[PDB]
Design a binder for this molecule. Structure first.
Ligand SMILES: COc1cc(C(=O)[O-])ccc1O
Ligand SMILES: COc1cc(C(=O)[O-])ccc1O
Length: 164
């Protein structure tokens, strides 16, 4: 596990998106993962794997209300670094029914960071996003659909990141 993932799981969300300055909203509402956006800053991005594998409902209490109830889910928790400096922690939960067809690849991603560049085959949409916060830090959670199949993606922005 990891202190940053512990922090990510403590974020508290608002049903309504706050009226933040537009520079900060550009970042939080971005329709993609942070990969290319961070590279844009003049950085090399790398992933540290914290935890990966199949888990049962009891391991995903925060996400369960937002996804289909199934026997198993694929869990992916990472730390994203920019030139060696941690900038983000992320937690992705995929119901196993979403793992079919091209989407089965979500399972073999490893240390490659997630991004729209990887799913050119599938159709991508987001039906919900909320902004959260904890102890001065910003986070967000989104339900994305690949070819109609859902997954939940949560991101915590570390203070080293450009949002601050
Ligand atoms: C938030 O992460 C993403 C968002 C969206 C989106 O919101 O449409 C698409 C792909 C992503 O990897
Ligand atoms: C680089 O940005 C992201 C990567 C991942 C990942 O690889 O699981 C998740 C959320 C992100 O914003």
């Amino acid at each position: 596990s990891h202190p940053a993932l512990t922090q990510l799981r403590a974020l508290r969300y608002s049903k309504e998106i706050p009226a933040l300055d537009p520079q900060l909203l550009d970042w939080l509402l971005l329709e993609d993962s942070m990969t290319k956006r961070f590279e844009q800053q003049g950085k090399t991005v790398s992933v540290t794997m914290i935890r990966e594998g199949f888990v049962e409902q009891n391991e995903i209490p925060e996400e369960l209300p937002l996804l289909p109830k199934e026997s198993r889910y694929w869990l992916r928790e990472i730390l994203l670094s920019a030139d060696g400096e941690p900038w983000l922690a992320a937690r992705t939960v995929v119901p196993v029914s979403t793992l079919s067809g091209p989407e089965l690849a979500l399972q073999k991603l490893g240390k490659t960071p997630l991004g729209r560049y990887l799913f050119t085959s599938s159709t991508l949409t987001r039906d919900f996003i909320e902004i959260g916060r904890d102890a001065g830090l910003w986070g967000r959670r989104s339900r994305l659909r690949l070819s109609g199949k859902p997954l939940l993606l949560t991101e915590l922005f570390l203070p080293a990141s450009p949002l601050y």
